[PDB]
Design a binder for this molecule. Structure first.
Ligand SMILES: *[C@@H]1O[C@H](CO)[C@@H](O)[C@H](O)[C@H]1NC(C)=O
Ligand SMILES: *[C@@H]1O[C@H](CO)[C@@H](O)[C@H](O)[C@H]1NC(C)=O
Ligand SMILES: *[C@@H]1O[C@H](CO)[C@@H](O)[C@H](O)[C@H]1NC(C)=O
Ligand SMILES: N[C@@H](CCC(=O)O)C(=O)O
Ligand SMILES: N[C@@H](CCC(=O)O)C(=O)O
Lengths: 736, 756
């Protein structure tokens, strides 16, 4: 346990993590390049500039009592005892890089009223002034960081996400803060596992495998320390698992975390505190040699580890820090700001308690911890030292002693040839300002974005949601074909006669398929009906060339029977349905009535009787609603059939009754006995009518054949009349 | 403000005498049981060790007992007195709260001071790397968490909620139980509620609504401290939720009367756990015999008098009151563990004294600077028996063996033992009384057979979804389709045989062919018998004596054909159906064609040639029949409407006969082709009278009856039924044609001979 002691009137403590934590045998092992050495040298440089600064403590010199925490809370607490040895002197300590280390040291420092200013600890529970009333920090808490990455996740539509955190006072409170923030943003959590402080590589592999237990999640947030993040990346590479990471300031832009794990870190988004490099610190650090810098006791180990050599072998003088590239650690600015804030507090307290002399007066030899704390909580407002060219950064302390929630967003690239650098692609100044153009996996020419969701989306119109009553992880259950997806929560219906197609919200598709004139079953009678009309036209033509009244009526009577057959096949309408009932009844009656006239002024009487049939037909049709109607099937798989009315009504029966009476009237001519010829027509007419009844009876359904056979009966009925009452007559004039 | 006792060896002490203060006040309300009873246990134990000749002879033990004040930060500044002189106490009795002990542990270990806690149950303090100088006499929460989930399993509910407070005990308690629940798999947490250590106004009212949101999780598990449980129970009374919640208290609420004081109606039947313990009869006598005069060593005892007796030194206080009768007295459950912790440190000192100072009776010179490193190894190696005979021992990590027992709060208002935990549960449900056997489960089971089991995000909630009347439930996980010839059982689990619909007499349509067949057979039997009876030479000359007989037999075969059409469907008979209709139709048509041709030929032996032509026409029909006989000797057809089964399962049974549409058309077409020849011959002949008139009528009847066959037979497709309609219409069509043809010729022959 080496000590860094600097002579001075009053000394400042230091708690930098110079050495990384070791195994069970050793308290702490290797020295870290950036987090331990660079920050310690930054504090030493800041102390050097303060001593020679005439405007800041010109008459009193500032010392140092920096100790190594070895990245452990117990060792840091022993060094805190080393701090409080004088009090049981140390006016203040500039240390506490780790949050658990900061809390452990502040717990002891509260008893002795020793103020503490931290440069890297961002734990949200350190803002509790009741528990830590002597603690301050130049960095913001983790609540703003959780808000920032919640906004980042919302930007990339990242809902179903996995949470990885390291146990302690930093990863934990961070993970609950992040989950609390993401709950309000409708962000789900797949798994929540913790990283132990003393865990082996097999345990890291187990954690990585547990991450893979949910293929649904693709992105994992990291609240682990640098060593834990590095081990997790190594385990992910070993298992050949490709992941995208959204890490906290623990990872940041540290190259040691991605050392040897460049493949598994591709596309990882890491945010870090917004800081600027110090031009003077780079020159100060690059001009350091192990012989010249005897002030630092740990510099020899740094030289041995960085430039691989041995002091005993005497092969370390060849290397130099100027030749090798130098990269400033991000939190150097925060260390400098903390040291300068403590120095400014001391200067203000000396200017308000020792106004006469310039050196440390006798009224301040015991330094009051409470007075000093209330002197740098309020009286610290000055331009940040070593601002690059024109920035307006100032060191400020709020009522909680925290900093400003200003963050920078980075991502890990390839940069063509192997360089594997970090590139800033946004910032969080109380608002997300991502730049997707600089991220080489979010460009439109890179394919679909890496998606981490729980429930796969689905086209609303074809398949509807289920609303499981949860925040996410829903299901897609399609609605039945007679349901329109009017709303995402539940589908609706267009109503009877409308098919929910096209837009699927307002549909209004109604099919109106008809029997058509070219039906397979109707192909027969349409040719027969046309043939009968053609035969009637030939019979009508010779009549004009030649009982005159009886023959003309009969020829005309056969004409409209075939004419109405073409009306039925084509299409039904409002006027068609009305004429269909009246025409069919009248034509059958007039043909039989005209035949009765041949059996027996007389023409006027039979037409007058026929006129009475029309009056009865109108009365029957009036009570039958002769208007057309597109009747809908009981179920949906059919369409409207355009049925005028029920065919089982008395409209057909009443017409047949008059026809039967007229047919029975012609039967009287058989008793009188072309008397033989007419009797044959009635006998055939009754049989063909009697043969139609079984056809209509069995075919209750399939209305197409019902209209087809109806046309068949009327078509051949006229042919029988014209083939038995006029064909023998034509034989004596044409054939003979 | 602390208790100071002079002695050769000083023992530290930390007790929560006062409750946690509200707002900025460090100390709140006095704790009469958690703070006073436990503190007096140390005083009672020290006065008993100092009077025991066999334990530390001639060596007195002092005490420096401080006030924890139930605050983690407040105990740290008090503990500074134990180590201020170092940069003297050899060890301390650890605090009650797990969080309080942690800061004391990492500070006393920092000064090599062993610590033994009597009530600190936390897996965090079990780590030997950070708390190697810390020891405990009670089991850790890891064993308690395993015990809690065992009680949950045995009580037949697996959907519960977790309630915890801020600190290293409540947060690590629910986390340990959740981790053990994940290994179980059958138990899930609906939600987790974390009570802040500095709640605002109405905070406890808000968390009740959080548990009230999920009404399914009627049983909740609470890991809160004594003060929080009292406020949580009070908030339940505000929401009128008494009896709705089933509480699962931790070791912080095992048998304490403070969280249930004035709240007997609420939290009835709450199941509580606590490490195995027995009541100490020596402490009860010691405590009950304390007054304001004899007990002046305890500074807080004067304050305890007002709180216990509800007086002041309000109503005035008389200095003659007794604890055991003027107020309710029941010693704290952890009093025994305080005795064990004091005796364990005293036993180790005696064990270290006999080795370090063998000759000396008091403190030898090489023992006055006691070092914690040497004292600690003697702390872990004590195997004595404490009061009530319980064996106390420390493991390598300084922990105690896992021992637990289960209480239940019942009203008849006391805790009753209902079980125990000794690495396995020994619950006694028959004594548990709360609602009979309350259950807190998600998605209550459904098993009518049709209802499938769907797994939601939480494995506890089994979503319920029926299976339609088309598939069978092979298992509760998924239901699968029945075979197409199988109809699902009444319950969807498994399938059942599909019925059938055979053709038998008694049907509305099948009745007519049977009646006509009887009439047709009788009519054709009478005429053939009449000709055989008296065979007149003029009538037989026109008949031919060979053509008429086969026509009657051929027509009679059609009447026999319809008999087997409706007969029992069999593979032999159904295959022979085409033979019956084919032979009957061909015989009637062929002989009729020959008769028409012979009459036409003479108009514009002879009967011997006519029958040869008819036989030749029969031969070609038979030759074609033989081709159709072997082309597909199909047995029968089963599925008629079952081929395209209906959506419901009301009725799909159908019984058909092996028949082909092409075969039926070809068989009918051959007969119709012969009838077409008769149509042409009859038309030309229509221009002998006894032959033209009947023949013209026969072709007239066949054409019309066949003309109605096409739309009925072809139009029955996609109707209600096809096999039932088709067979009936086919039988009547051939029967009517045979009856009309035979009747038209037989009747004039019988009538002519009647008048002759
Ligand atoms: C998903 O992200 C894209 C940008 O990549 C954005 O345009 C879109 O709106 C996001 N999704 C939703 C539902 O807002
Ligand atoms: C650092 O030490 C080297 C010798 O090791 C010396 O040459 C050099 O001048 C020193 N740098 C200084 C004094 O700035
Ligand atoms: C204590 O003694 C008993 C009796 O010999 C036996 O359990 C063992 O020796 C010791 N027990 C433990 C747990 O060390
Ligand atoms: N800032 C993190 C890590 C410290 C560091 O950046 O080194 C913490 O609060 O502990
Ligand atoms: N066992 C609990 C509370 C014990 C008690 O009632 O004091 C803890 O470790 O915090």
């Amino acid at each position: 346990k080496k000590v860094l002691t600097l002579e001075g009137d009053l000394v400042l403590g230091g708690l930098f993590p110079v050495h990384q934590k070791g195994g069970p045998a050793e308290d702490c092992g290797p020295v870290n390049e950036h987090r331990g050495i660079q920050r310690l040298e930054a504090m030493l440089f800041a102390l050097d500039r303060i001593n020679r600064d005439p405007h800041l403590l010109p008459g009193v010199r500032l010392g140092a009592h920096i100790l190594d925490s070895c990245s452990k809370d117990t060792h840091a607490l022993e060094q805190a005892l080393d701090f409080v040895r004088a009090s049981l002197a140390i006016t203040g300590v500039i240390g506490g890089s780790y949050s658990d280390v900061s809390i452990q040291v502040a717990n002891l420092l509260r008893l002795f009223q020793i103020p503490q200013i931290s440069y890297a600890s961002t734990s949200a529970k350190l803002s509790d002034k009741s528990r830590y009333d002597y603690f301050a920090r130049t960095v913001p808490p983790d609540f703003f960081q959780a808000k920032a990455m919640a906004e980042i996740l919302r930007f990339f539509n990242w809902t179903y996400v996995s949470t990885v955190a390291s146990e302690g006072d930093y990863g934990e409170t961070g993970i609950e803060a992040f989950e609390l923030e993401a709950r309000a943003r409708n962000i789900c959590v797949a798994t929540s596992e913790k990283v132990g402080r003393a865990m082996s590589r097999a345990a890291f592999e187990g954690v990585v495998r547990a991450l893979l237990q949910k293929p649904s999640a693709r992105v994992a947030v990291l609240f682990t320390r640098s060593e834990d993040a590095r081990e997790l990346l190594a385990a992910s590479q070993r298992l050949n698992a490709s992941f995208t990471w959204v890490a906290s300031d623990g990872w940041g832009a540290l190259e040691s975390v991605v050392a040897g794990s460049e493949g598994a870190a591709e596309g990882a988004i890491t945010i870090e505190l917004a800081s600027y490099p110090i031009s003077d610190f780079a020159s100060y650090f690059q001009s350091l040699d192990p012989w010249n810098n005897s002030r630092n006791p740990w510099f020899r180990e740094f030289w041995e580890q960085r430039f691989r050599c041995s002091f005993r072998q005497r092969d370390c003088a060849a290397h130099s820090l100027r030749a090798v590239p130098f990269e400033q650690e991000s939190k150097i600015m925060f260390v400098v700001n903390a040291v300068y804030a403590m120095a400014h507090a001391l200067h203000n307290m000396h200017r308000a308690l020792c106004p006469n002399t310039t050196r440390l007066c006798d009224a301040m030899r015991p330094v009051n911890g409470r007075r000093l704390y209330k002197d740098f909580v309020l009286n610290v407002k000055f331009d940040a030292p070593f601002r690059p060219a024109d920035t307006h950064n100032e060191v400020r302390f709020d009522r909680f002693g925290d900093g400003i929630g200003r963050y920078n967003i980075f991502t890990y690239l390839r940069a063509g040839s192997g360089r594997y650098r970090y590139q800033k692609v946004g910032y969080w100044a109380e608002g997300l300002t991502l730049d997707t153009s600089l991220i080489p996996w979010a460009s439109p020419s890179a394919g679909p974005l890496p998606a981490s969701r729980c429930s796969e989306p689905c086209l609303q119109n074809e398949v509807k949601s289920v609303q499981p009553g949860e925040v996410c992880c829903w299901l897609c259950i399609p609605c039945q074909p007679y349901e329109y997806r009017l709303d995402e929560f539940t589908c609706a219906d267009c109503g009877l006669g409308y098919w929910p197609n096209a837009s699927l919200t307002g549909c209004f598709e109604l099919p109106q398929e008809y029997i058509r004139w070219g039906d397979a079953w109707a192909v027969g009678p349409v040719t027969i009906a046309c043939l009968g009309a053609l035969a009637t036209l030939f019979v009508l033509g010779v009549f004009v060339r030649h009982g005159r009244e009886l023959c003309y009526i009969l020829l005309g009577g056969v004409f409209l029977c075939y004419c109405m057959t073409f009306i039925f096949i084509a299409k039904p309408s409002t006027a068609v349905c009305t004429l269909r009932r009246l025409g069919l009844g009248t034509a059958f009656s007039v043909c039989y009535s005209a035949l009765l006239t041949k059996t027996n002024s007389q023409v006027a009487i039979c037409l007058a009787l026929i006129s009475g049939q029309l009056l009865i037909v109108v009365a029957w049709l009036v009570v039958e609603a002769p208007g057309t109607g597109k009747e809908t099937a009981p179920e949906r798989r059919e369409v409207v059939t355009l049925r005028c009315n029920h065919r089982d009504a008395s409209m057909l029966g009443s017409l047949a009754y008059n026809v039967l009476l007229i047919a029975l009237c012609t039967l009287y001519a058989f008793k009188t006995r072309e008397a033989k010829f007419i009797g044959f027509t009635m006998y055939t007419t009754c049989i063909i009518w009697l043969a139609f009844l079984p056809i209509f009876y069995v075919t209750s359904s399939d209305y197409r054949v019902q209209t087809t056979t109806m046309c068949v009966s009327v078509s051949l009925s006229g042919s029988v009349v014209l083939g038995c009452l006029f064909a023998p007559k034509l034989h004596i004039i044409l054939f003979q | 403000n602390s208790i100071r006792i002079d002695g050769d060896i000083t023992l530290g002490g930390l007790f929560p005498v006062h409750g946690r203060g509200s707002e900025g006040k460090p100390c709140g309300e006095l704790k009469k049981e958690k703070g006073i009873h436990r503190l007096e246990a140390m005083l009672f134990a020290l006065d008993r060790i100092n009077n025991d000749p066999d334990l530390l002879p001639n060596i007195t033990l002092g005490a420096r007992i401080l006030d924890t004040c139930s605050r983690d930060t407040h105990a740290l500044e008090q503990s500074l007195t134990f180590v201020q002189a170092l940069i003297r106490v050899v060890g301390v009795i650890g605090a009650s709260g797990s969080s309080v002990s942690i800061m004391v542990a990492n500070i006393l270990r920092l000064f090599k001071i062993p610590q033994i806690s009597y009530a600190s149950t936390a897996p965090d303090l079990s780590d030997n790397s950070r708390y190697d100088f810390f020891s405990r006499v009670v089991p850790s929460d890891t064993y308690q968490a395993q015990a809690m989930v065992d009680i949950v399993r045995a009580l037949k509910w697996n959907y519960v909620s977790t309630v915890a407070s801020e600190g290293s005990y409540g947060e690590s308690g629910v986390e340990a139980f959740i981790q053990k629940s994940r290994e179980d798999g059958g138990v899930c947490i609906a939600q987790s509620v974390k009570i802040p250590r500095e709640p605002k106004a109405g905070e406890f009212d808000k968390i009740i609504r959080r548990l009230l949101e999920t009404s399914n999780a009627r049983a909740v598990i609470i890991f809160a401290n004594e003060d929080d449980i009292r406020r949580v129970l009070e908030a339940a009374r505000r929401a009128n939720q008494t009896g709705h919640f089933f509480w699962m208290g931790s070791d912080s609420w095992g048998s304490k009367i403070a969280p249930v004081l004035h709240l007997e109606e609420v939290a009835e039947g709450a199941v509580t756990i606590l490490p195995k313990r027995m009541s100490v009869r020596g402490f009860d006598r010691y405590f009950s015999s304390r007054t304001l005069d004899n007990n002046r060593r305890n500074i807080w005892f004067a304050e305890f008098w007002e709180d216990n007796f509800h007086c002041k030194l309000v109503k005035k206080c008389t200095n003659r009151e007794r604890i055991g009768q003027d107020s309710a007295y029941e010693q704290e459950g952890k009093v025994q563990f305080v005795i064990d912790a004091v005796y364990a440190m005293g036993h180790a000192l005696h064990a270290m004294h006999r080795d370090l100072c063998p000759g000396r009776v008091g403190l030898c010179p090489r023992m006055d600077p006691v070092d914690g490193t040497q004292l600690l190894k003697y702390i872990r190696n004590v195997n004595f028996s404490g009061i009530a005979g319980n064996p106390v021992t420390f493991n390598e990590n300084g922990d105690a063996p896992g021992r637990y027992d289960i209480y239940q709060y019942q009203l008849r208002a006391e805790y009753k033992v209902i079980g125990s935990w000794t690495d396995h549960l020994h619950l006694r449900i028959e004594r548990m009384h709360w609602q009979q056997l309350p259950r807190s489960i998600c998605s209550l089971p459904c098993q009518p057979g049709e209802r499938k089991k769907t797994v939601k995000g939480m494995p506890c909630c089994w979503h319920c979804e029926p299976c339609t009347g088309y598939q069978y439930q092979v298992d509760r996980y998924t239901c699968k389709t029945c075979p197409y010839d199988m109809r699902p059982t009444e319950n969807r689990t498994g399938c059942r045989p599909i019925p059938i619909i055979k053709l038998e007499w008694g049907s509305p349509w099948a009745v007519l062919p049977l009646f006509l067949a009887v009439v047709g057979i009788a009519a054709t039997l009478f005429v053939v018998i009449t000709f055989v009876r008296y065979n007149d030479t003029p009538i037989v000359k026109a008949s031919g004596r060979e053509l008429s007989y086969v026509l009657l037999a051929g027509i009679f075969l059609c009447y026999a054909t319809t008999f087997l059409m409706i007969a029992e469907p069999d593979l032999g008979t159904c295959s022979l159906r085409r033979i019956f209709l084919g032979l009957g139709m061909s015989i009637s048509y062929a002989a009729l064609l020959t008769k028409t041709n012979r009459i036409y030929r003479i108009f514009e032996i002879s009967p011997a040639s006519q029958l040869a032509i008819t036989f030749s026409l029969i031969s070609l029909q038979l030759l074609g029949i033989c081709v159709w006989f072997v082309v597909d000797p199909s047995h029968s057809v089963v599925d008629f409407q079952d081929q395209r089964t209906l959506d419901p399962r009301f009725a799909r049974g159908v019984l058909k006969c092996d028949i082909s549409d092409l075969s039926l058309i070809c068989l009918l077409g051959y007969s119709m082709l012969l009838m077409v020849t008769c149509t042409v011959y009859a038309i030309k002949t229509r221009g002998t009278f006894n032959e033209a008139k009947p023949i013209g009528f026969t072709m007239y009847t066949t054409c019309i009856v066949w003309l109605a066959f096409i739309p009925i037979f072809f139009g029955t497709s996609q109707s209600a039924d096809k096999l039932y309609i088709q067979t009936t219409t086919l039988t009547v069509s051939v029967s009517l044609s045979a009856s009309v043809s035979l009747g038209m010729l037989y009747m004039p022959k019988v009538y002519i001979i009647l008048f002759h």
